[PDB]
Design a protein around this ligand. Sequence first.
Ligand SMILES: COc1ccc(-c2ccc3c(c2)CN(CC[C@](C)(C(=O)NO)S(C)(=O)=O)C3=O)c(F)c1
Ligand SMILES: [Zn+2]
Length: 299
Amino acid sequence: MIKQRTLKNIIRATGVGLHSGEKVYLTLKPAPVDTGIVFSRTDLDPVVEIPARAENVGETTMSTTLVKGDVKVDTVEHLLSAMAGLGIDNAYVELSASEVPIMDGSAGPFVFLIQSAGLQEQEAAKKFIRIKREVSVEEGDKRAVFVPFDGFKVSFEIDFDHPVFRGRTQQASVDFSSTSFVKEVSRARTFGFMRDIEYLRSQNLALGGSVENAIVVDENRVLNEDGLRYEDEFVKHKILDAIGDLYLLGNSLIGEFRGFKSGHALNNQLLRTLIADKDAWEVVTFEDARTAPISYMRP
Ligand SMILES: COc1ccc(-c2ccc3c(c2)CN(CC[C@](C)(C(=O)NO)S(C)(=O)=O)C3=O)c(F)c1
Ligand SMILES: [Zn+2]
């Protein structure tokens, strides 16, 4: 069968929240079968746990935020993308502060630490959410779609009137039914504009943000000394974001996601819309990895 996966070993990372600027200690732990990804504020007494599930999304403003009462876990999308990309079903994610560390602004450092620690297959069928019917949401200009697809593939298009974007509108489509995640999207960094930065810092947003953890876009140029990891790094990062927001379903997807100027807000409306429409999806397992439409890296 395709089996559930957890961490082989505990991972510890220190970093800074992108939005909060707060210093945060991250500990990823193995978790039992069917735990899913559960975030835990270990700075609070008692400790507050929040499953990474669509129903626990609060603010979807400049990040995906999980809420339980007053308690928030901010900017989960890059870590969850890493979890989803590597096929990790079960883990505890402990944080000493509200926000996941931004690292280099990609999922790269997370996939490096996880893959260094290694993965543990568990004696239980991995569950997938299979898209059975088209499901679509639109906030005027913006579109987010699930389509039936025998595998896992993500298409995105952004279209910002800004000279940095080649003049050519950056679009990408990636099939992740095999092992393209690490190579293709893992290293694509978040990005923001010199134009917006003083106002956002006014709203206590992007306080931790620097060239060290983001693509910083001037009027006409990327400011980073070393420029871009990829020609389409911007749209690849939007794909990384979508994979993490989609993992809030709680299981890997069998289907196609298509985003059109989509962000955290619309991604979350699409999951809620999907979850409501029970004829549009079912949960499937695979007793024989050889006939499954998804394959995973050696553990
Ligand atoms: C040093 O100068 C600057 C200027 C602007 C920024 C900056 C300003 C704002 C933002 C970011 C960076 C990253 N970031 C998150 C981006 C975004 C929300 C995202 O990646 N979410 O996962 S996105 C690409 O979907 O729009 C911001 O909103 C900075 F970090 C530094
Ligand atoms: Zn992002």
